[PDB]
Ligand binder design. Structure first.
Ligand SMILES: Cn1nc(C(C)(C)C)cc1NC(=O)Nc1ccc(Cl)cc1
Ligand SMILES: CCCCCCCCO[C@@H]1O[C@H](CO)[C@@H](O)[C@H](O)[C@H]1O
Length: 332
């Protein structure tokens, strides 16, 4: 066990190994930047907020650790370290997660820089590349947005989840469809890409209902073949109540964009989640011809998610989380 030192950052208490120094708050779980004395690189340390307060927090904590420990991809957050100041399972109450500090997030990059088409190609390719991997483990991000994308000075990108958000969310979520295919993340990609192309939020809704109305104005109210799939009659005529919108021609919306980008946007921003391009299909799209390599777009090892169906006690979840901390092997 390393020696742990205590500190206070925004009234919050931080006990970390001496390995990490110059802790400076970045986010509020709360996130600090730090200097890793072992490797000489800048890291980000997230302290989990009250990780075992309820059964639901506790399962979420286990979920987070298990997830991060599995992610081993260039375009997805990777775990460098996980620690607790506790020496036993009995004292165990805090969890800290360590990852490589990429200098900025995608929102704080697009806030001034007008990106070129080549930027869009490369940034979107990377998002789709990490998503191909995430999807292959049967994981859905569910909250993809520019603030959940870390970018370095080479415009290399990693997908993570730091934990309006609605601006990038699939319409079938905001209407609790329940199901969700993995192309909910593809909808979010379309929203991001559109914004990288125009420099403007695509659907900047003021609230939940404005969000949906802005969406329908672009993509149109549901076609016959979509309505054909709606099990619930309540839902079916709630939809058939809303103003009947024609689908917009995207070429007439993204006026000066690369016609291949417009074509890809059309395949991503389809209302019917069954008709949406997948991550793997999108990688093979001609828009990314300069970046696509079918032998360097890897998929994930099998990910055992059976815990998700389990209903356990706080101490059980807590205990399983502790085992995962102890058994952690850092990357090379
Ligand atoms: C919950 N979750 N889901 C994912 C995906 C889906 C991208 C693999 C990633 C994560 N979790 C995180 O990305 N967590 C995290 C940990 C430390 C820092 Cl400094 C920032 C973020
Ligand atoms: C305004 C109404 C637009 C929302 C239409 C939802 C289109 C998605 O379509 C549905 O999505 C589910 C996602 O889990 C799939 O599992 C269903 O089988 C599919 O039919």
């Amino acid at each position: 066990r390393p020696t742990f030192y205590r500190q206070e950052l925004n009234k919050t208490i931080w006990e970390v190994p001496e390995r990490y120094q110059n802790l400076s708050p970045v986010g509020s779980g709360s996130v600090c930047a730090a200097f890793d004395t072992k490797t000489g690189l800048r890291v980000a340390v997230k302290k989990l907020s009250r990780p075992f307060q309820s059964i639901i927090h506790a399962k979420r904590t286990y979920r987070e650790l298990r997830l991060l420990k599995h992610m081993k991809h260039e375009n997805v957050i990777g775990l460098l370290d996980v620690f607790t100041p506790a020496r036993s399972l009995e004292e165990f109450n805090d969890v800290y997660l360590v990852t490589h500090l990429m200098g900025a997030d995608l929102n704080n990059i697009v806030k001034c820089q007008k990106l070129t088409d080549d930027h869009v190609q490369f940034l979107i390719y990377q998002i789709l590349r990490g998503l191909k991997y995430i999807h292959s483990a049967d994981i859905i991000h569910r909250d993809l947005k520019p603030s959940n994308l870390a970018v370095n000075e080479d415009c290399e990108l990693k997908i993570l989840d730091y934990g309006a958000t609605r601006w990038y969310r699939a319409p079938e979520i905001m209407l609790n469809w329940m199901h969700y295919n993995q192309t909910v993340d593809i909808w979010s990609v379309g929203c991001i890409m559109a914004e990288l192309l125009t420099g403007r939020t695509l659907f900047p809704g003021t609230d939940h209902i404005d969000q949906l109305k802005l969406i329908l104005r672009l993509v149109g109210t549901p076609g016959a073949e979509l309505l054909k799939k709606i099990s619930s009659e309540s839902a079916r005529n709630y939809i058939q109540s809303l103003t009947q919108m024609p689908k917009m021609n995207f070429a007439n919306v993204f006026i000066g964009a690369n016609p291949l980008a417009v074509d890809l946007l059309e395949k991503m921003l389809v209302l019917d989640s069954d008709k949406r391009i997948t991550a793997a299909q999108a990688l093979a799209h001609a828009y990314f011809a300069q970046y696509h390599d079918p032998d360097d777009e890897p998929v994930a090892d099998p990910y055992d998610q059976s815990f998700e169906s389990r209903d356990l006690l706080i101490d059980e979840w807590k205990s399983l989380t502790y085992d995962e901390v102890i058994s952690f092997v850092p990357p090379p």
